[PDB]
Scaffold this active site. Structure first.
Site, PDB file in Angstrom:
ATOM      1  N   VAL A 198       1.041  -1.152  -0.048  1.00 47.94           N
ATOM      2  CA  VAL A 198      -0.076  -0.164  -0.061  1.00 47.94           C
ATOM      3  C   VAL A 198       0.723   1.296   0.090  1.00 47.94           C
ATOM      4  O   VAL A 198       1.803   1.282   0.671  1.00 47.94           O
ATOM      5  CB  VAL A 198      -1.053   0.286   1.181  1.00 47.94           C
ATOM      6  N   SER A 199       0.507   2.204  -0.905  1.00 45.79           N
ATOM      7  CA  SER A 199       1.280   3.472  -0.919  1.00 45.79           C
ATOM      8  C   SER A 199       0.492   4.567  -0.067  1.00 45.79           C
ATOM      9  O   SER A 199       1.571   5.466   0.573  1.00 45.79           O
ATOM     10  CB  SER A 199       1.416   4.089  -2.266  1.00 45.79           C
ATOM     11  N   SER A 200      -0.720   4.501   0.323  1.00 51.94           N
ATOM     12  CA  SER A 200      -1.260   5.377   1.229  1.00 51.94           C
ATOM     13  C   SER A 200      -1.900   4.813   2.293  1.00 51.94           C
ATOM     14  O   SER A 200      -2.292   3.572   2.363  1.00 51.94           O
ATOM     15  CB  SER A 200      -2.429   6.527   0.294  1.00 51.94           C
ATOM     16  N   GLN A 227      -5.731   3.660   1.574  1.00 53.80           N
ATOM     17  CA  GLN A 227      -6.128   2.379   0.792  1.00 53.80           C
ATOM     18  C   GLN A 227      -6.394   0.982   1.843  1.00 53.80           C
ATOM     19  O   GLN A 227      -5.689   1.037   2.986  1.00 53.80           O
ATOM     20  CB  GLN A 227      -4.933   1.897   0.031  1.00 53.80           C
TER      21      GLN A 227
END
Lengths: 125, 125, 126, 126
Positions: free
Chosen positions: C8-10, C13
């Site tokens: 996950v980047s954020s 999410q």
């Protein structure tokens, strides 16, 4: 005859480039249509264009995703043009030059690429 | 209903074997024709088959090469069965409908399989 | 063994559904990571996960974009698992592990779809 | 530097021409091997060339079938040239064409052409 089809869901998009690109590739009559590509049943402009073009003519668009964001509907349209002997071309990917040494493989790849581009359109919706 | 199709370029081959593969797969009615396989327009028996099958029916063959050995003509024939909603199953490559869980990827790979097989027909002639 | 990888980047999410989808397909150990997918040289967890898997094991992910949003680097990872006798698996595409006709036609189409998905991943990033 | 690789399953196959094609495309050193291409096991001359070539170099062949008559091996040998930053050129194929305004798509096209030729290579074997 070279017929061009341009579509945009909204004027927020750049209709210039799409219209200019179609015209750059020698589009005589161009059918613009402001509608969603989710279906071909509510786009009478496209239906009028397809019924317009006949044998010998050339149907071109800036990109396949403009022709529709529905795989089956896009594929059905591509084969309708084939069975009606209307050459389909794309401003983005013209693909008029030979890539593979074999003539049969080139047809297969160009038919494959269009199917790939057709799916991605629905893959984005 | 489940309709089949069998073709023979030269009677020297095992026609009785091919006719059995269709019944083994569940063919009720089987059409038989004897032609070169170069063009579908000169094969009236094959035309009678495509016309008899209706919506929901299943069209089967031992292999794609039996259907024809011209890529464009074979692809055109398959699309005719798509629009009419007739499933084209091959005894040679027994694969089930819904090849993948994803609906879109299923449509893409179903069409891709038939293109690859059709490209082999002309490739082998 | 069945190793899973989730990224996950954020923080927005939904990481939960991703882990629950991995567990649903037999994930025993998972390597979760919070980092951008625009590269792999800054993702140490993804590389420790690739080292962990051995011949016969299963490397499962939810979607291809989870593996990365760089075509060349996602393709590199897919072949690494290939050459290491490790099956790549995607929750988004159920029954992907099946064979579609002969092994050849299957190996050609499955590889095409992964490349297309690998392309769409980067295409959406930039 | 441009390194070539020529192979002939039998002396009946034209070799002196295959060398001309490689040399016509600017090959400086050509590794000639004589054995079936079903596997990379009985082809040490190939691995000798693959180990020899390194970053920056260019690896050329007459066609995909010379690089192997197996999809899994061809694709494996192709990615080995990617990871070493060595461009692969095939004499048979033309110059292709520019995908103007889409560098990402060119990366995908070049991979699609190889997989098609790779599959077709194995299909002709049987």
């Amino acid at each position: 005859m070279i017929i061009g089809y341009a579509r945009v869901s909204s004027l927020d998009q750049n209709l210039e480039r799409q219209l200019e690109n179609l015209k750059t590739f020698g589009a005589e009559k161009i059918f613009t249509e402001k509608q969603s590509g989710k279906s071909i049943e509510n786009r009478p402009i496209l239906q009028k264009a397809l019924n317009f073009v006949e044998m010998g003519d050339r149907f071109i668009v800036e990109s396949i995703d403009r022709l529709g964001r529905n795989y089956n509907e896009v594929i059905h349209t591509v084969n309708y043009l084939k069975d009606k002997e209307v050459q389909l071309m794309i401003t983005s990917l013209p693909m008029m030059n030979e890539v593979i040494g074999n003539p049969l493989l080139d047809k297969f790849m160009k038919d494959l690429v269009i199917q790939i581009l057709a799916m991605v359109s629905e893959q984005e919706r």
